Every structure is written in C-alpha cells, then in structure tokens.
Amino acid sequence: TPKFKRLPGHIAIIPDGNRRWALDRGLEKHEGYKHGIVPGLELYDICVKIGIGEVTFFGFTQDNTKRPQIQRKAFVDACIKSVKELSKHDAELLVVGNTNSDMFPKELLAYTKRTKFGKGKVRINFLVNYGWYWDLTYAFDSKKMIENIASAEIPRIDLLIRWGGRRRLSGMLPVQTVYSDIYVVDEMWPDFKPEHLFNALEFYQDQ
C-alpha cells in the first residue's frame, strides 16, 4: 500500500470481461464468472487494508438476464457465491436490485437490508438484477424523488474502476456516477491484480 494523500470515500467496480477471459483460456463463455469471485475478495481485502470505506460492485443488470440460460445461471451463481464469501469477512453488505422479478436470486433477498458481518470494516454494495431505468423510476415531492431512487442507500461514487477495457458506465448508478473519476483497466476482471487498484488510486489522488 503506497502513502496516499487522499483516498476515494466510495469506489465503484465494473468487473467486466469474464466471457472474453474464458474464451481466451479455451473455456465456455459461462465458465469465466467463477474466476471473478477471488478477484472480488482480493479487491475487498486490499480496500480494508488501505482504508477504503465503501465499494459498490456491479453484479448484473436486468439486460444481462436476457443472455442464454447457461450464462445467467453461471453469473447468478458467482454473484451469490461472492456475497456468501464476503459475509465471512468484516463487510457491511447491501444488495440493490429489482426484487419484484423472477430474475432476482432469492438467496440474495436476505441482503437487501444492509447487514454487518464480523467487524463491518467496509460497506460493500452489490447491484443484482439492477437497471438504471428501474432505479430512477422507483422514485415515483419531486425534490425528494432523487432521495427515493431504488439505490438511494448507495452514496455518490468518487472513483469508478472498470476492467475489460470498455470506457462506459453500462447504466451503473447514473445519479451516483455524475462526477465520478473513471479509470479503465484493459485486462479482463479475472486477470485482476493489486496494481490495477493502486494505479486507479494514484490517478484519483493526482486529480
């Protein structure tokens, strides 16, 4: 951990590129997701160590659920597993997504209220069956409207880091990302390395 002058209060993670990573290894597209779990736990461990107070992971969107059944089952399975694993750490977990849907995994409804595990050293939010349109329309007092979006328990994002080399938000939290610094890692998510985060934090503070 370098000697940061400043850290983001809240980091957003877009763990993109699981299918490309799988194909590059001669695996089926759906086999990449299971290789994205340990990168998530590694990223949390570093966040806890350097003092990041809040991380939001983009888990999957409603549009993601139109992918073939074999992909949907693999990425939902890996999301549930990621949350289960994170609950054996010191994380205050919140899952945000459209629960009024057969595409919302029932195993994750338990975490739609923020749940402190062990010492609760870092807030971790997970977007599960998330959609920007669902999020903004949930609100329907118009000045309150923003305070009543589905994702209102998720605060403003300081720094958004995206793996897989695409420079775009894919509709992650349009309200919380208005002013976010955006750092894009070319490597696919399962090729996560600590220096990816350190490079993003160096960028954030030299800003």
Ligand X SMILES: CC(C)=CCC/C(C)=C/CC/C(C)=C/COP(=O)(O)OP(=O)(O)O
- Binding-site residue ranges for Mg(2+): 16
Minimum CB distance to ligand X, residue 12 (Å): 11
The Cα 160–Cα 197 span in angstroms is 10
Minimum CB distance to Mg ion, residue 166 (Å): 7
Q: By CB under 6 A, what part of segment 77-96 binds ligand X?
A: 78-79, 82
Minimum CB distance to ligand X, residue 81 (Å): 7
Q: Which two tokens stand for residue 175?
A: 């309200």
The helix (run of H) or strand (run of E) holding residue 76 is helix 69-86
How many residues are given for the chain? 207
Nearest residue (CB) to ligand DMA, 16 versus 158 = 16
Q: Give the one entry of Mg ion, ligand X, a second copy, none that residue 183 binds, where binding means its C-beta sits below a cut-off of 5 to 8 angstroms depending on kind.
A: a second copy
Nearest residue (CB) to a second copy, 23 versus 184 = 184
Q: Which two tokens stand for residue 79?
A: 């999301």
Minimum CB distance to ligand X, residue 64 (Å): 5
| Segment interacting with ligand X (CB under 6 A) among 11-19, 45-53, 92-100, 140-148 | 11-19
Known binding-site residues equal 16
Q: Which two tokens stand for residue 200?
A: 């993003």
Minimum CB distance to ligand X, residue 82 (Å): 4
* Count, residues near a second copy per rule CB under 8 A: 28
Cβ-Cβ contacts under 8 Å for 130 (sequence gap 6 or more): 58, 59, 60, 61, 62, 96, 97, 98, 151, 172
Q: What DSSP string runs through 86-120?
A: HTTSSEEEEEES--SSTTS-GGGGGGSS-EE-TT-
Q: Residue 98's closest CA among 136, 58, 62?
A: 62
Adjacent-strand bridge partners of 162? 14, 184
CA geometry: angle 11, 17, 18, nearest 5 deg: 105
Q: Give the one entry of ligand X, Mg ion, a second copy, none that residue 20 binds, where binding means its C-beta sits below a cut-off of 5 to 8 angstroms depending on kind.
A: ligand X
Adjacent-strand bridge partners of 159? 11, 181
Residue 16 found at the interface with Mg ion (CB under 5 A): yes
Nearest residue (CB) to ligand DMA, 140 versus 179 = 179
Which chain residues interact with a second copy by CB under 8 A? 132-133, 136-137, 139-143, 145-146, 166-171, 174-175, 177-183, 203, 207
Which chain residues interact with ligand X by CB under 6 A? 15-20, 33, 36-37, 40, 57, 59-60, 64, 75, 78-79, 82, 164
